[PDB]
Scaffold this motif. Structure first.
Motif, PDB file in Angstrom:
ATOM      1  N   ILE B   2      -9.065  -7.261  -1.629  1.00 41.40           N
ATOM      2  CA  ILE B   2      -8.216  -6.518  -0.697  1.00 41.40           C
ATOM      3  C   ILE B   2      -7.965  -5.085  -1.176  1.00 41.40           C
ATOM      4  CG2 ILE B   2      -5.950  -7.145  -1.662  1.00 41.40           C
ATOM      5  CD1 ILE B   2      -5.309  -7.661   1.518  1.00 41.40           C
ATOM      6  N   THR B   3      -7.542  -4.224  -0.255  1.00 45.89           N
ATOM      7  CA  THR B   3      -7.270  -2.831  -0.582  1.00 45.89           C
ATOM      8  C   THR B   3      -5.769  -2.572  -0.663  1.00 45.89           C
ATOM      9  OG1 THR B   3      -9.285  -2.059   0.497  1.00 45.89           O
ATOM     10  CG2 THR B   3      -7.584  -0.423   0.130  1.00 45.89           C
ATOM     11  N   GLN B   4      -5.339  -1.957  -1.760  1.00 42.40           N
ATOM     12  CA  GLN B   4      -3.928  -1.651  -1.960  1.00 42.40           C
ATOM     13  C   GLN B   4      -3.631  -0.197  -1.595  1.00 42.40           C
ATOM     14  OE1 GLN B   4      -3.231  -4.235  -6.014  1.00 42.40           O
ATOM     15  NE2 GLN B   4      -1.569  -3.799  -4.566  1.00 42.40           N
ATOM     16  N   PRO B   5      -2.614   0.039  -0.744  1.00 42.34           N
ATOM     17  CA  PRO B   5      -2.240   1.392  -0.322  1.00 42.34           C
ATOM     18  C   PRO B   5      -1.529   2.170  -1.424  1.00 42.34           C
ATOM     19  CG  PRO B   5      -0.689  -0.187   0.572  1.00 42.34           C
ATOM     20  CD  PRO B   5      -1.753  -0.989  -0.128  1.00 42.34           C
ATOM     21  N   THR B   6      -2.048   3.353  -1.737  1.00 43.54           N
ATOM     22  CA  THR B   6      -1.461   4.195  -2.774  1.00 43.54           C
ATOM     23  C   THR B   6      -0.234   4.931  -2.243  1.00 43.54           C
ATOM     24  OG1 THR B   6      -3.802   4.671  -3.190  1.00 43.54           O
ATOM     25  CG2 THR B   6      -2.267   5.610  -4.726  1.00 43.54           C
ATOM     26  N   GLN B   7       0.444   5.655  -3.127  1.00 39.63           N
ATOM     27  CA  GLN B   7       1.636   6.404  -2.747  1.00 39.63           C
ATOM     28  C   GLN B   7       1.279   7.547  -1.802  1.00 39.63           C
ATOM     29  OE1 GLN B   7       4.449   6.987  -6.050  1.00 39.63           O
ATOM     30  NE2 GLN B   7       2.841   6.303  -7.459  1.00 39.63           N
TER      31      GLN B   7
END
Lengths: 151, 10
Positions: B2-7
């Motif tokens: 899965i892809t994690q959203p950065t700040q």
């Protein structure tokens, strides 16, 4: 000299089969690859798009980087079309960068000479850069535009 | 995985 001769050509291979652009990682993470497309299809086709490349940690993606948590399966995509020009399409969850400048996702941008795309922005230590090498041969071909006629 | 959203700076 028979077998040795075959090896000589191994290192000295005639590059420019039908290459569009060449992706080169400067940060040392992904192996250099060559993007290619059909000239006839590009010259004949001048609408929508011809052939686009997808880059990311996905094994499907035309470009396999690795598996960066910040980067997406298909972080970025490159589309070739227009009237003899290339286009860059960003397709990352966090965004795609060009020479430090963040572009609009899923947006078409005009290619640049030796351009570079940065990805994985958010953490100083989690950014990856890539370089785009345009094949002068492809450009020269378009400038001449050969005609296809039978006999 | 899965892809994690950065700040992001608003």
């Amino acid at each position: 000299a028979t077998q040795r001769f075959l090896i000589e050509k191994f290192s000295q291979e005639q590059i420019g089969e039908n290459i569009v652009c060449r992706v080169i990682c400067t940060t040392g993470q992904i192996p250099i690859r060559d993007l290619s497309a059909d000239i006839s299809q590009v010259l004949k086709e001048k609408r929508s798009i011809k052939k686009v490349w997808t880059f990311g940690r996905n094994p499907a993606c035309d470009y396999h980087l690795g598996n960066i948590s910040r980067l997406s399966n298909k972080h970025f995509q490159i589309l070739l079309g227009e009237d003899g020009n290339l286009l860059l399409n960003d397709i990352s969850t966090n965004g795609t960068w060009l020479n430090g400048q963040k572009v609009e996702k899923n947006s078409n941008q005009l290619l640049s000479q030796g351009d570079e795309i940065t990805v994985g922005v958010g953490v100083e230590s989690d950014i990856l850069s890539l370089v785009i090498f345009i094949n002068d041969k492809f450009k020269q071909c378009l400038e001449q535009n050969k005609v296809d006629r039978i006999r | 995985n899965i892809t994690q959203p950065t700040q992001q700076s608003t």
